[PDB]
């Protein structure tokens, strides 16, 4: 059930022995070909499904060409054929209230999307060096982040300082140190402590939080 | 002890402060974002300097005076806080996109902790 | 079963039914409904002699309203003929609650609560929360209780969980083992049932356990994500 | 048969390789005569059962086929194409060129010797007893085969099949080949006898029916199939035989990944490996190793219709292991380096843990306990206390964990632990769940395996409901047991304890009362010997030096300085092990000097009687401990000088360990 299209007569067999001769059959495994097989369930993008239900799911069988491409938590977009398989109603007798038509997708060519791959031209890569020549752009980025809230420029520079990230140089034959940065807030209520916490997730660059 | 920055958000009441607030929420019921996400994700692929004897000479002086002023005042600080004091300036040079740890980065690192502690 | 018709001391029971495609996906949970169909019998082999089970084969749901905005035109004709008469704000306060002596300041708070404001997805990342949430605290015998059953029938979607919190961790989400494939998926909630409308609870003195830690995230941003053993998904909420 | 049963004509045959192994006779004269034939003689005389047929003897054999301009097909081509097919045509080449009666074994001095010849002559005389079944070739081997690839500059000479690929990229055309993979070995099973040959006896004809062994499930045959005991009205009823059935070795293991070449995404996964021949009993849990071996999948033969469609669940088959990273026996030259240079009290103090600032007192308090020694050979039933335990307290910011635990990961048999995991109930051994093999085994924690060593603990406020029992039961001598409903057996207890209790919130207030943050009064003031502290006082000159201390490690990567030559840890380990083999006996003037010491210890402790700073009220349990560490320091610095000056080193340490709080 992998040729994706033609429902051939299956071969309910693993390995044959003794073809029409008196020779003990030998098998060359270097010239025997293989392929892989991986199922993955896809939820619903839980913003455009309207509020009357929990997210649903279906599943998709892909092949070797785009395995290990799918980290759990990626805005993926697949395209394939729609396909049913399995005997519903005859393989057991009396068959009462048992669906026997599994939904499958035997597909191809996934793409990550963004709403890691952003190729830029010579133009924008030069302009970003051209504005790098200014000696103020650390301050402009602080004020151009949260377009709703006054002040807190000590907080505002900290977020962009944390989000971009500091390195950790691992010790050779020694324990590396902390190279992560971990900031904290506290405040009396309704003072925008949770405001700026939700919009770091929109520009997160594949950093999905709980 | 495993965290570094404990920002305590104030909510003090000043008649010019809240008046400025009142219109700015009102003006929004009706330098760009995708350039910003490119700039940081380009700056995760540039080299890391770590190396200038000038910048490391000034910060330890900057530590020692507050090392006299942490214990007789508000909050005791530890040796791992120095690993912040390299790390903020280390990322601050990553904003600069350069391979020389300058002097100017060490001034914003000290001044940011000074509001965080005082 | 509609929980009003056979009271002696019993608990209600339940049936099962199927349908065809050009009448499916026509119901949301939490509604009054009526239905007409057959009472035939299937026999599942997954208990004594050869016994079977009951189920309904439905035919047509000539329901009441949905309680997805398509309807006829003579309904809106009278509505526009009423909305030009500018006496709506004062005439509702007499006509909403025909069993309530006055209470003019409170009564106006309920009609604005039922309809709400809007929602901005304004061209940046963040959002405003377009909703209002009221409280009624006061002495016993001032009709704060029986006023709340009155908003339940008039709402499009309403639930009524008004008592004792009802295990406030299991108010929003529940996961359990499964009879088939032994899995952990999401099933239950009081909020996910009640989107678009209004919930109503009480007793905010003697719940200290989890009732406050369950509504802090559920309110003010209306975006929960369960981090239990399976999924971590941000399901929508506009309660 | 029709419908695409024949294949295309392949140019790669086997008969062209079959005769090319026939010219693996005596011809390789570059590497005293035929060297691979020389190894053939040291197996037939029955002392070793593993030949090694490398690629080096193939490539040099192909090196001197650079001048014979004839058609010789490639060898490392086909043996990476289908590697498993390169052992069965191999053994059918050795038998025509094996010199059999080259050994001399009379009656004994060989396992299974007279009886196989008894069996062979019982089949040889029954080869001509008519006035017939030949041996399958698997019966008379008594040997195995092995392979070994190359990753040396011969690969950079002229041309791959032996790059250390990870598990992650391996699912492609690498199935049915020979690939090596590095990893970390886990889940070591045992060694069980597998079957390779069979012998059924029917006790009528004695004709032992042989068969090849297939996969893990098979079936015996009938009794009316033979040549003599069959074909009549009476047939001998078959059954098995043990001693006439040669059995092999077998052991299963699982691999993981190095956790440094894993990508940022998914978790690593396992893989199955097997053993054959005699590479067995040569792996261990925790071996940072690599195996080279050949690849094949296996059928599942169970519930194959509904489930198990064409799933494969392969393993790899092992061929070679290249393990890595492992007393007056050519090591005495470095024992003399400590004897000639001397310098016990200071250079060894700078040797262990030179990566801190100050604190030479506490780095000296530990090296005496890393040698220990037998307290006293008591003879009679007086099991005396040994192995004193030192605890620490205080809250520095210099990451106190990697101060102590770095000592533990270089000290002998000293196992690391923490608060989570092996708690005080799972500190000893217990019975748990296991896989489908033998369940209810006695899985242990730390103290049933780290006997007579170092129990380096942290996080003393963690899981204390079980831990507070757990610390007393080892400070109490010899009651490490499992007092469960399974058994009531009790094992030994001989291990030292090194504790570091963290304070209460913020700093321990020295102006406040002590024991505000340790919760065990009875475990401390009567059953320990010495304490310390890591209190932080503001001091300008030290901290800027401490500032240069921590900043120096960033611009460079090296930390050493201050005119100390760094010492290898094996040297002091040999010095400890040699010092542990002395055990001097004290004189009389030493016990004369401690009775006056204890009186002067008694009088001043009986002056304060206050709850301000000090602890203890001069127990003899402190008196016996000061005898314990003295002979310990007399063990490490043995010049046979157990005297007043040796114990003057001892009270020198108890006075500086005490009153660490008075600053
Ligand atoms: N300090 C502030 N400056 C400007 N606007 C603010 C501030 N605090 C709150 N707001 C406005 O209030 C709205 C919601 O604030 P928010 O709910 O994030 O408070 P919070 O951070 O969640 O506090 P808490 O977590 O204690 O509920 C935002 O739309 C924001 O415009
Ligand atoms: N303002 C009012 N107008 C009309 N009826 C009222 C009013 N206040 C109370 N009632 C009547 O009280 C009757 C019983 O209500 P009940 O005594 O249960 O109130 P309650 O629940 O005790 O008040 P509370 O919720 O403050 O304890 C109802 O039939 C209701 O009609």
Of the candidates D392, D345, D622, D364, the residue with the CA atom closest to the CA atom of residue D503: D392
A contacts of D176 (beta carbons < 8 Å): 29-30, 32
Strand partners, D499: D391
Residues A30 and A5 occupy one common structural domain: yes
How far from the centroid of its chain's Cα atoms is residue A71's Cα?
A: 4
CB atoms within 10 A of CB B77: 20
Among C44, C195, C234, the residue with its CB nearest the CB of A96 is: C44
Cα–Cα distance measured from residue A55 to residue A51, given in angstroms and rounded to the nearest whole number: 10
Residues A58 and A1 occupy one common structural domain: no
Output the 3-class SS for B48-104.
Answer: CCCCCHHHHHHHHHHHHHHHCCCCCCCCCCCCHHHHHHHHHHHHHHHHHCCCCCCCC
Residues A63 and A15 occupy one common structural domain: no
Which residue minimizes the CA distance to atom 9 of ligand 2? C143
Which ligand has its closest atom nearest to the C-alpha of C141? 2
Check if the beta carbon of residue D368 is closer than 8 Å to that of residue D608: no
In sequence order, the 6+-apart residues with CB closer than 8 A to the CB of D32 are D38
CB atoms within 10 A of CB D211: 14
Using CA atoms, how far residue A189 sits from A185, C222, C239, D404, in Å, is 12, 17, 21, 43
Cα–Cα distance measured from residue C25 to residue C19, given in angstroms and rounded to the nearest whole number: 10
Q: Which two tokens stand for residue D238?
A: 């078959």
- Beta strand D178-184 with D315-321 is unpaired
Among A132, A148, A203, the residue with its CB nearest the CB of B28 is: A148
Check if the beta carbon of residue D596 is closer than 8 Å to that of residue D590: no
Q: Which two tokens stand for residue C98?
A: 């025909």
Measured at the alpha carbon of residue D116, what is the angle toward residues D114 and D120, in degrees to the nearest 5? 115
Q: How many CA atoms lie within 13 A of D159 on its CB side?
A: 9
* Burial status of residue D635 (CB atoms within 10 A of its CB: 0-12, 13-18, 19 or more): buried
Measured at the alpha carbon of residue A153, what is the angle toward residues A147 and A157, in degrees to the nearest 5? 90
Q: Which two tokens stand for residue C1?
A: 């079963």
Give the distance (Å) from ligand 2 centre to CA of residue D413: 78
Domain D328-657 has CATH 3.40.50.300: yes
CB-based contact B7 A203, cutoff 8 Å: no
DSSP code per residue over D387-437: ---EEEE---SS-THHHHHHHHTTSTT-EE--SSSS-SSSSS-EE----SS
C239 is in an annotated binding site: no
Cα–Cα distance measured from residue A109 to residue A81, given in angstroms and rounded to the nearest whole number: 12
Cα–Cα distance measured from residue D620 to residue D184, given in angstroms and rounded to the nearest whole number: 50
The 3-state DSSP class for residue C216 equals helix
DSSP code per residue over D286-350: T-EEEEEEEEE-----SS-SSS-SS----EEEEEEE-------SS-HHHHHHHHHH--TTTTTTT
Check if the beta carbon of residue C178 is closer than 8 Å to that of residue C185: yes
A contacts of D169 (beta carbons < 8 Å): none
CB-based contact A28 D85, cutoff 8 Å: yes
Using CA atoms, how far residue D98 sits from D40, D50, D92, D104, in Å, is 8, 15, 11, 16
Cα–Cα distance measured from residue C105 to residue C110, given in angstroms and rounded to the nearest whole number: 10
Residues A55 and A28 occupy one common structural domain: no
Cα–Cα distance measured from residue C89 to residue C109, given in angstroms and rounded to the nearest whole number: 12
How far from the centroid of its chain's Cα atoms is residue D504's Cα?
A: 40
Output the 3-class SS for D80-101.
Answer: HHCHHHCCHHHHHHHHHHCCCC
Q: How many helices (H) and strands (E) does chain A have?
A: 4, 5
Q: Which atom of ligand 1 is nearest to the CA of C128?
A: 29
- Beta strand A76-85 with C41-42 is unpaired
Residues A24 and A71 occupy one common structural domain: no
Give the distance (Å) from ligand 2 centre to CA of residue C140: 9
The ligand 1 site (C-beta within 6 Å) comprises A 148-150, 189-195; B 21, 25; C 128, 220
b/e string for D350-378 if b means 16 or more Cβ within 10 A?
Answer: bbbbeeeeeeeebbbbbbbbbbbbebeee
- A82 sits in which H/E element: strand A76-85
Q: Which two tokens stand for residue C203?
A: 């007793």
Output the 3-class SS for D92-136.
Answer: HHHHHHCCCCCCCCCCCCCCCCHHHHHHHHHHHHHHCCCCCCCCC
Q: Is C166 left (phi over 0), alpha (psi -120 to 50) or beta?
A: left
Measured at the alpha carbon of residue D498, what is the angle toward residues D493 and D504, in degrees to the nearest 5? 125
Q: Which two tokens stand for residue A147?
A: 């377009």
State phi, psi for D104 to the nearest 5 degrees: -135, 100
Residues A26 and A1 occupy one common structural domain: yes
CB-based contact D82 A31, cutoff 8 Å: yes
Residues A22 and A75 occupy one common structural domain: no
How far from the centroid of its chain's Cα atoms is residue D176's Cα?
A: 31
Of the candidates D39, D282, D217, D281, the residue with the CA atom closest to the CA atom of residue D144: D39
Cα–Cα distance measured from residue D324 to residue D289, given in angstroms and rounded to the nearest whole number: 6
Residues A42 and A7 occupy one common structural domain: no
- A108 sits in which H/E element: strand A102-112
The 3-state DSSP class for residue C128 equals coil
CB-based contact C128 B33, cutoff 8 Å: no
Q: Kindly report the nearest CA distance between residue C85 and chain A, in angstroms.
A: 35
A contacts of C40 (beta carbons < 8 Å): none
Of the candidates D381, D367, D486, the residue with the CA atom closest to the CA atom of residue D428: D486
Using CA atoms, how far residue C13 sits from C2, C3, C6, C32, C128, in Å, is 10, 10, 11, 16, 43
Of the candidates C44, C239, D470, the residue with the CA atom closest to the CA atom of residue A93: C44
Cα–Cα distance measured from residue B9 to residue A152, given in angstroms and rounded to the nearest whole number: 9
> Directed axis angle between helix A153-164 and helix B33-42, to 10°?
50
Q: Which atom of ligand 1 is nearest to the CA of A192?
A: 21
Check if the beta carbon of residue D166 is closer than 8 Å to that of residue D268: no
Residues A23 and A50 occupy one common structural domain: no
Residues A43 and A103 occupy one common structural domain: yes
Domain that residue A22 falls in: 1-35
Q: Where are the beta strands (DSSP E) in chain C?
A: 17-18, 36-38, 41-42, 53-54, 56-60, 174-176, 185-188, 223-225, 234-236
Of the candidates B86, B77, B74, the residue with the CA atom closest to the CA atom of residue B110: B86
Would you say the C-alpha torsion D483, D484, D489, D495 has a positive or negative sign?
A: negative
Strand partners, D290: D182
């Amino acid at each position: 059930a992998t040729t994706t299209l033609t429902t051939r007569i299956p071969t309910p067999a693993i390995y044959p022995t003794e073809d029409t001769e008196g020779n003990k059959l030998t098998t060359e495994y270097g010239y025997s070909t293989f392929i892989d097989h991986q199922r993955i369930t896809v939820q619903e993008m839980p913003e455009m499904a309207p509020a009357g239900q929990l997210p649903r799911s279906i599943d998709v069988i892909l092949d070797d060409d785009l395995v290990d491409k799918t980290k759990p938590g990626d805005r993926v977009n697949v395209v394939g054929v729609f396909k049913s398989l399995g005997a519903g109603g005859m393989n057991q007798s009396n068959s009462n209230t048992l669906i026997g038509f599994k939904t499958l997708i035997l597909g191809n060519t996934v793409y990550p999307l963004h709403a890691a791959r952003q190729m830029l031209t010579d133009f924008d890569i030069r302009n970003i060096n051209k504005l790098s020549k200014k000696k103020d752009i650390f301050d402009i980025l602080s004020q151009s982040l949260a377009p709703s809230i006054y002040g807190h420029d000590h907080i505002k520079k900290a977020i962009l300082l944390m989000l971009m990230g500091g390195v950790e140089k691992n010790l050779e034959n020694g324990s590396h140190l902390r190279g992560d940065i971990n900031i904290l807030m506290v405040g009396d209520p309704s003072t925008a402590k949770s405001q700026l916490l939700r919009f770091v997730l929109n520009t997160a660059s594949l950093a999905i939080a709980t | 002890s495993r965290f570094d920055l404990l920002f305590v958000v104030t909510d003090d009441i000043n008649e010019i402060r809240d008046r400025s607030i009142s219109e700015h929420v009102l003006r929004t019921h009706r330098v760009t974002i995708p350039f910003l996400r490119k700039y940081v994700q380009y700056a995760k692929e540039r080299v890391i300097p770590q190396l200038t004897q000038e910048a490391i000479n000034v910060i330890v002086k900057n530590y020692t005076d507050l090392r006299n002023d942490d214990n007789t005042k508000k909050s005791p600080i530890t040796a791992r806080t120095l690993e912040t004091l390299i790390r903020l300036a280390t990322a601050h040079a990553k904003v600069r996109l350069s391979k020389t740890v300058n002097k100017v980065d060490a001034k914003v690192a000290a001044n940011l902790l000074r509001f965080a502690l005082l | 079963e509609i929980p009003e018709l056979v009271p002696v001391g019993e608990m209600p029971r339940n049936l099962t039914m199927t349908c065809d495609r050009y009448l499916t996906n026509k119901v949301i949970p939490g509604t009054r409904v009526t239905i007409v169909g057959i009472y035939s019998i299937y026999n599942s082999k997954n208990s004594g002699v050869a016994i079977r089970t009951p189920y309904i084969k439905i035919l047509g749901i000539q329901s009441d309203v949905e309680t997805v905005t398509m309807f006829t035109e003579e309904e809106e004709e009278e509505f526009l003929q009423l909305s030009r008469n500018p006496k709506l704000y004062e005439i509702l306060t007499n006509s909403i609650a025909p069993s309530i002596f006055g209470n003019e300041d409170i009564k106006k708070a309920i009609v604005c609560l039922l309809m709400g404001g809007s929602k901005k997805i304004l061209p940046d990342g963040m959002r405003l929360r377009g909703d209002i949430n009221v409280l009624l605290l006061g002495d016993p015998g001032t009709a704060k209780s029986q006023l709340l059953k009155f908003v339940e029938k008039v709402s499009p979607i309403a639930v009524y969980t008004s008592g004792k919190g009802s295990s406030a961790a299991g108010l929003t989400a529940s996961v359990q083992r499964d009879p088939m494939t032994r899995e952990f998926y999401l099933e239950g909630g009081a909020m996910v049932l009640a989107d678009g409308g209004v919930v109503c609870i009480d007793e905010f003195d003697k719940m200290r356990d989890e009732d406050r830690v369950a509504i802090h995230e559920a309110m003010e941003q209306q975006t929960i994500s369960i981090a239990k053993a399976g999924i971590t998904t941000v399901l929508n909420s506009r309660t | 048969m029709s419908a695409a049963l024949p294949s295309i004509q392949l140019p790669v045959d086997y008969n062209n390789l079959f005769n090319e192994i026939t010219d693996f006779l005596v011809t390789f004269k570059q590497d005293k005569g035929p060297k691979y034939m020389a190894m053939l003689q040291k197996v037939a005389n029955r002392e070793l059962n593993s030949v090694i047929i490398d690629l080096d003897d193939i490539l040099q054999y192909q090196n001197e086929k650079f001048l014979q301009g004839t058609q010789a097909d490639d060898l490392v081509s086909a043996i990476q194409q289908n590697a498993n097919h390169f052992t069965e045509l191999f053994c059918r080449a050795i038998d025509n060129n094996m010199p059999l009666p080259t050994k001399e074994i009379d009656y004994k001095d060989d396992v299974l010797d007279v009886i196989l010849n008894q069996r062979r002559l019982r089949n040889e005389r029954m080869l001509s007893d008519r006035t017939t079944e030949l041996f399958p070739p698997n019966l008379t081997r008594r040997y195995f085969l092995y392979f070994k690839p190359l990753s040396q500059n011969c690969a950079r000479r002229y041309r791959i099949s032996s790059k250390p690929l990870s598990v992650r990229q391996i699912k492609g055309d690498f199935l049915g080949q020979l690939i090596t993979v590095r990893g970390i070995i886990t889940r070591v099973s045992d060694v069980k006898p597998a079957v390779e040959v069979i012998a059924y006896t029917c006790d009528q004809c004695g004709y032992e029916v042989f068969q090849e062994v297939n996969s893990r499930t098979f079936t015996p045959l009938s009794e009316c199939t033979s040549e003599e005991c069959s074909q009549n009205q009476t047939k001998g009823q078959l059954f098995m035989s043990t001693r006439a059935s040669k059995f092999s070795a077998f052991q299963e293991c699982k691999i993981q990944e190095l956790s440094q070449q894993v990508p940022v995404g998914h978790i690593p996964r396992s893989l199955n490996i097997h053993v054959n021949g005699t590479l067995v009993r040569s792996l261990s849990p925790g071996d940072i190793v690599d195996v080279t071996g050949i690849f094949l999948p296996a059928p599942y033969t169970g519930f194959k219709a509904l489930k198990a469609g064409l799933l494969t669940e392969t393993y790899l088959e092992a061929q070679f292991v290249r393990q890595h990273k492992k007393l007056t026996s050519d090591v005495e030259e470095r024992v003399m380096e400590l004897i000639t240079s001397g310098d016990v009290y200071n250079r060894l103090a700078k040797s262990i843990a030179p990566e801190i600032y100050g604190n030479l007192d506490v780095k000296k308090a530990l090296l005496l306990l890393l040698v220990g020694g037998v307290d006293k050979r008591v003879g009679d039933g007086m099991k005396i206390r040994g192995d004193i335990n030192v605890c620490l307290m205080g809250d520095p910011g210099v990451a106190k964990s990697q101060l102590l635990k770095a000592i533990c990961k270089i000290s002998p048999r000293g196992v690391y632990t923490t608060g989570k995991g092996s708690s005080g109930v799972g500190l000893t051994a217990a019975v748990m769940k296991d896989p489908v093999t033998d369940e209810m085994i006695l899985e242990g924690g730390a103290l049933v395996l780290a006997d007579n060593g170092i129990c380096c603990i942290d996080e003393f406020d963690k899981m204390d409901e079980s831990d507070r029992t757990a610390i007393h039961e080892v400070m109490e001598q010899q009651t490490i047991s499992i007092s469960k409903a399974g058994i009531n057996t009790t094992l030994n207890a001989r291990t030292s304890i090194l504790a570091a209790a963290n304070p209460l919130y913020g700093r321990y207030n020295p102006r406040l009362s002590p024991l505000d943050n340790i919760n065990l009064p009875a475990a401390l003031l009567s059953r320990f010997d010495i304490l310390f502290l890591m209190l932080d006082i503001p001091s300008r000159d030290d901290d800027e030096k401490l500032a240069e201390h921590v900043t120096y490690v960033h611009m460079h990567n090296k930390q050493p300085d201050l005119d100390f030559t760094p010492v290898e840890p094996s040297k002091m380990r040999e010095y400890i092990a040699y010092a542990k083999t002395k055990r001097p006996v004290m004189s009389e003037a030493v016990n004369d000097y401690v009775v006056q010491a204890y009186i002067r210890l008694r009088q001043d402790s009986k002056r304060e009687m206050d709850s301000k700073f000090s602890f203890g009220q001069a127990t003899p349990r402190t008196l016996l401990g000061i005898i314990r560490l003295s002979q310990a320091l007399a063990k490490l610095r043995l010049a046979d000088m157990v005297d007043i000056d040796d114990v003057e080193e001892a009270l020198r340490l108890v006075r500086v360990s005490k009153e660490s709080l008075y600053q």
